[PDB]
Amino acid sequence: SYNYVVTAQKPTAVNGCVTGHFTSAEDLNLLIAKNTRLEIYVVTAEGLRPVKEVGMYGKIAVMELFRPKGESKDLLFILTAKYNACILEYKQSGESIDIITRAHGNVQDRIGRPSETGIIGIIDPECRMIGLRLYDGLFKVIPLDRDNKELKAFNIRLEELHVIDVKFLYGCQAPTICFVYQDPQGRHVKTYEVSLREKEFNKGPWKQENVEAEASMVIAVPEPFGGAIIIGQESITYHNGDKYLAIAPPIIKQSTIVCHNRVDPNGSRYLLGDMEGRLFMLLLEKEEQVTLKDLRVELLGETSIAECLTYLDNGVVFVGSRLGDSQLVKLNVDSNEQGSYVVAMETFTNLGPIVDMCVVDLERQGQGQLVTCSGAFKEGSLRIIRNLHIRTVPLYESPRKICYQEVSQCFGVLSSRIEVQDGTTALRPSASTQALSSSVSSSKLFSFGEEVEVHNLLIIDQHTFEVLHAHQFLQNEYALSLVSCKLGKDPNTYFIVGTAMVYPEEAEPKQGRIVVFQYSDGKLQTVAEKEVKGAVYSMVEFNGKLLASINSTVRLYEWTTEKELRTECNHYNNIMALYLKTKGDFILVGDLMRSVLLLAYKPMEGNFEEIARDFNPNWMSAVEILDDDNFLGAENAFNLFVCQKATTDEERQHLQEVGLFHLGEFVNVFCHGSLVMQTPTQGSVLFGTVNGMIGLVTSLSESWYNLLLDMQNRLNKVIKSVGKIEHSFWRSFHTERKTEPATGFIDGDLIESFLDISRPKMQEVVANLQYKREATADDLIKVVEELTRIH
Amino acid sequence: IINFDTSLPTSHTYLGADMEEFHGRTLHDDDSCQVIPVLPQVMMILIPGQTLPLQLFHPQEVSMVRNLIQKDRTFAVLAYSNVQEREAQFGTTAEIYAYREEQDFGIEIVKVKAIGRQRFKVLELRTQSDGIQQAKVQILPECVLPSTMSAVQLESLNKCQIFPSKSYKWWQKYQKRKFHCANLTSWPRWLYSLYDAETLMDRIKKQLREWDENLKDDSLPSNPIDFSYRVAACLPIDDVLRIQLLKIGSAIQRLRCELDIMNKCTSLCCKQCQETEITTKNEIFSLSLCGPMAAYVNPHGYVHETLTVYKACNLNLIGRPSTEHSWFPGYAWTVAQCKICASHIGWKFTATKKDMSPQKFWGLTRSALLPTIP
Amino acid sequence: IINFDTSLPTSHTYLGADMEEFHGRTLHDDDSCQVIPVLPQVMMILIPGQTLPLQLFHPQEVSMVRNLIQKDRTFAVLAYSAQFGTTAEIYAYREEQDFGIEIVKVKAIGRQRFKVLELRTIQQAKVQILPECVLPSTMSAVQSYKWWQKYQKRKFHCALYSLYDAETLMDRIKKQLREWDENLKDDSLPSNPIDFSYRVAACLPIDDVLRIQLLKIGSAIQRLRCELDIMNKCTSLCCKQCQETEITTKNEIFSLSLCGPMAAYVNPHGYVHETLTVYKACNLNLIGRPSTEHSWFPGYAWTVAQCKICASHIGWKFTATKKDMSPQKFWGLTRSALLPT
Ligand SMILES: O=C1CC[C@H](N2Cc3ccc(N4CCC5(CCN(C(=O)c6ccccc6)CC5)C4)cc3C2=O)C(=O)N1
Ligand SMILES: O=C1CC[C@H](N2Cc3ccc(N4CCC5(CCN(C(=O)c6ccccc6)CC5)C4)cc3C2=O)C(=O)N1
Ligand SMILES: [Zn+2]
Ligand SMILES: [Zn+2]
């Protein structure tokens, strides 16, 4: 297989943001790490002015600004998920802007398992070292000397394996870390002093303490207060030597606090963000003998569910979201309307998480549009994307699956909302509680404060995107699959929904339904309802019949003239058929553990028989049939793989992995289609990911594959990567178990970058290359422009 | 109610006391190719962590073992698909950890106790002059997978991925907080719970507790790999399924398959005549800390995988009770065989002393049983 | 060449030493009816003068024998063709508690032949003691080869009668017996036709279907005639389950005990086996390990032997446990597994 991957839409989810003085000593700068992109803005009264955008050969996991002594402006430390560490500077000479690499290295350890709490990265306030927590029981120190250009690091063993959070303390004479850890006795706060000369830990400035059973956040309070603040599920405590304070406000018990930010340089005010979108202000009270007098928490308002916060200036706060649009809000002294002090100023689009999507020619102009189910919880919405213009349709609940029915001119959307047992009460008005017409399921078949998922099928108009109808499902029913097809010889078009009956006392569902609805004359009508003995994980129309997965079984159904589903054949697989794809008479079955199974339907024998199989233990998030021989999948550690289908039975019955690639994204959905008006590229598969990035995979001929592979290998020698990460290292299929180089895949972003280099660089890349004629710059420009045409 | 010392069966006291015992361990690189001597007469599918007692008496076997004790104490046990026409694709290495030499009743016999260590695939089999085969085998790696949420886990709520150690409410909270980020994907939380090592281990313990009424949690290993191998060693399943379980590299897949076997198994029938039901899965019970089923060696070097049950049916008792070489000290055995086909099924153990609990049970040899799966 | 002690198997020392020997013979009248306790677990055709070792564990039989030692120590072993049978007199006795249960091991000796009149349920058999039909010399009714020529001439000078004379028939049977008892002693075999014929019948590997016929013969002359006829007719032995696998031939039979080629021994679990000792056997696989535990021929180690075409236990292979012993190896084949041809 010879494939080609490009990015139609870059990642939109914000995974980190910091504020500092990066571009200039005066400019107030906001740095945003999304997934692999780094956006540097200059904060102004008018808002944000995008100054630069950079691409990293890695997923940014740590991103901090620090100013060592002797530097006029701040440097930027970035660690990636593959442990590429780098120290960068913003160099500008007139209109020219580029990011210099002051230092770089790889801080991976040959052995050691990643800590479950994840990568932690902190910088001492005096910039004497960088402390990284990547593996259990180890603490990596990178000295911050002026000549450590290779970022040489040394480990210090930690007696406490389960470290929750850790910070560097302010005001300490020597580098001191305060961290929260958990042992069987409970959760404790400890402090150490770091000795670089001795390369070890010394007893910390103040003693060990005991904190809330679920204390999980540490804040380092700058001078004059000093000390640390521990934030847990019920209480907020402050420690500084012998000094100790504690509060247990009731306004925070409803939701965990997961992000914070300091408003004042003295630490008098902090921002706090909860999981449900509440923004609080934490206040520290000053007394002069300077010591902290008292803590108090005041709810500020409601924002989009925050992944991170950063106070810019003049009461403007940037809220970085992964589940919704990022926000620029204003903090007002006077409460307004209900009493919220937060006034949203600006919004920034975020398509992630893209959990499902479809391709539809809404205008019939022969150009495809993409309809995606984006966001989660109150951030859920539909996004319509076309050649890149984006339209938004908020739902205020979680969309899960989407289908299109051209005959009735509507979309069917599986959705879920969260209700509190109180009868169950909805927390807000959402799409499923505000439809023009609605119905509730009724079938003979089959505490206080708890949360329950209420599922609905929403019929939504394709023109105005109004919720025409909302059908609520049975209590404790989980709608999993959704198709829109014509079955048998019936002329009617139906929505078909597969469900499961989920009970917390039951690990694996034992009951489920397949419900056939018909949408007509403004009402949704239940046309049929078939009970099954498992969860209907997936469903596909199959030559006018219905193929479905029920636990570990693949069942075939026919639409009898009396409008009922009648079993045709069963195939009892050992694996759970989560993923179910069809092409012609071939069926691809996959489960969550990377097992792939290719079967074929025999029209004459009327049964299923296995064609091929490939069982390799690894997490798999999606699958697709590229063609009759090659199958594309998304595999753990943000990878793409391509399996392929001898004269010997033992060999013809085995798929071989002919392609591997490291994408850097978690792919949720594949779908055949394209957004360009309808060649070296044959085929097209769009895919949508957790971070909101939309990508495209096409197939290439071996000649073109080799030409573009040589162009790649020649571009890597001219293109100056940021952080000096190597492209082959970046794109190597990576798993916690092993690492292989990329095979069978052409990085189309690197290829398309060929049009950004200068003419001398084009000549250098193209030198001694054979197009039989020696290739020149113009020919390769033609190649790359034709390749860019595909999207 | 039970009052038997469940640690007694695992000590294999019937093999004699004062057995020289070796400490230490020999482990091989996960992918290295090695050459290992094969013990011929072992028609058993050994599993890592399982204890194999042997009474070897052939001069070739005795000499090979005597050489082994002076070297790495590891030999090979091949998982034959066919008992006859030896044809093994997979196997496991057993490391001798107890050893005694004797000359009882006219010949020299070596009794050893070994324990399964590492699985492997059969790359080559070579006969040797002494008659002890040498197998060229590559060690098989035990793959470990991270949490399914590690890929999509949000950085902001990473710090919430630690739970206070500790029942329905606790597991509901564990599912709610561990798989919160399942909302970023296309599957629900209860789907990912079906692939969680901890939840699967707990669900398996909920049936190990049904078998062993007074099961102590501390006994079972606290990591999924050892737990899965231990559970696999004690399931009354035919050779096909045992080999299938043996070649599963993942601990999660092995746990899932073991759970499916436990849930689906209904009754155990005589293998020779498949139509007669000997017992049911609800009669099984654990008399030793190894589990319901364990391997024991009889006075003539034959290894039987005996499953203990409270009640059995369609069995004739033949011969006399005897406490000689009893595998369960304090009990007397009696040969039992199918009353439809007169094929040996196992023994009936009856307590010698009054007030012993249980007073009677049955030990059924695995090779003569067939589990029926719906 | 045989140097093994042929009186060792007869003592049945595998049953243990220090057995309470019961000395004193009891006999019933030649016609008188009797009631005798039948042992229900012995599926063997006992013969007068034949020794039967037993190992009883079941409580009912243990109690039966325990009370029977005090009274006449006679029980009944039925033929189980149960029409005919024999009376066995216990002459050695012991009780123990080996491996959990109380066990009584005994050695009895068949005494008299009886017809089964009735059985009442430990069964009690009402039976009739069949007499011994001993006949006077026919030639007197109406009135190394030189000695017998003088015999057949001078004794029958009053004359076919040689074919029916007790002395000449016994001599012919002895001639045909020397092939087996390589160490034959003229004093080893009994001096009368009755005991001689009973021993010969005891040591033949014939099938039960003919052992019953020999048992029901009441005349020693007829019993000798039948024994000679069968001895001449039989040639080879085959696996019973196959009926088409020869294991050994009559020329390989030899006598390792003074009782003859074949004798009955109990195994550690009370099962009685009539083992025939032969020099060579064919079509047999050896299973398991050699053991000297509970060996029926002291100084030898046994290994299980079974037919290699159906895996039916045929017997054991006894191998010497010390050089300088002869024979070094032989086979003990169980009667139930063998079929004559
Ligand atoms: O708790 C327990 C359960 C019982 C278990 N036990 C005791 C035992 C004792 C002995 C044999 N034998 C297996 C091999 C053996 C078979 C019989 N033999 C013939 O000669 C022969 C064969 C066929 C017909 C007639 C006689 C001697 C050799 C003896 C096997 C076992 C065994 O499994 C145990 O040890 N403890
Ligand atoms: O010179 C000689 C010749 C040999 C002869 N010997 C020794 C002997 C020892 C033991 C048994 N056994 C016969 C009954 C017995 C059978 C095996 N057992 C199971 O549990 C079992 C059954 C089936 C499958 C697996 C195990 C124990 C009970 C033990 C029979 C014999 C016997 O004939 C003898 O005494 N001396
Ligand atoms: Zn049977
Ligand atoms: Zn046979």
Residue numbers in the entry:
A (entry chain A): 2 to 290, 295 to 392, 710 to 744, 748 to 771, 781 to 979, 983 to 1015, 1022 to 1114, 1121 to 1140
B (entry chain C): 46 to 211, 220 to 427
C (entry chain B): 46 to 126, 133 to 172, 177 to 198, 220 to 235, 244 to 425
Task: Give the exact sentences the study uses for this entry.
Cereblon (CRBN) is an E3 ubiquitin ligase widely harnessed for targeted protein degradation (TPD). Cereblon (CRBN) is considered a prototypical substrate receptor that operates in the CRL4CRBN complex through an interaction with the adaptor DNA-damage binding protein 1 (DDB1). We report the discovery of a molecular glue degrader (MGD), MRT-31619, that drives homo-dimerization of CRBN and promotes its fast, potent, and selective degradation by the ubiquitin proteasome system. Mechanistically, MRT-31619 mimics a G-loop degron and elicits CRBN-MRT-31619 dimerization with one CRBN molecule serving as a neosubstrate; this leads to CRBN ubiquitination and degradation by the UPS.
Using purified recombinant CRBN-DDB1∆BPB (DDB1 lacking the beta-propeller domain beta) in the presence of MRT-31619, we obtained two maps at 2.9 Å and 3.1 Å resolution, respectively. The two reconstructions represent the major conformations resulting from the CRBN kink motion and were both used for model building. While both maps reveal a dimer of CRBN-DDB1∆BPB dimeric complexes, one DDB1∆BPB molecule is poorly resolved due to local flexibility and was omitted from the final models. Given its higher resolution (2.9 Å), we describe in detail conformation 1. The sole interface between the interacting dimers is the CRBN neosurface comprising the MRT-31619-bound CULT domain and the N-terminal LON domain. MRT-31619 is bound in the tri-Trp pocket with the glutarimide moiety interacting with cis CRBN H378 and W380 through three canonical hydrogen bonds, consistent with binding interactions reported by other CRBN-binding ligands. Surprisingly, the two molecules of MRT-31619 adopt a complementary helix-like conformation that bridges the two CRBN tri-Trp pockets. The helix-like MRT-31619 dimer is stabilized by hydrophobic interactions between its spirocyclic linker regions. The formation of the complex results in the burial of 1528 Å2 of the solvent accessible surface area of both protomers, an area larger than most transient protein-protein interactions (800-1200 Å2) and within the range for obligate homodimers. In the cryo-EM structure, the MRT-31619 phenyl carbonyl moiety forms a hydrogen bond with the trans CRBN W400 side chain indole nitrogen. Superposition of the CRBN-CRBN structure with CRBN-CK1α-lenalidomide shows that MRT-31619 closely resembles the surface of the CK1α G-loop degron and its essential hydrogen bond to W400.
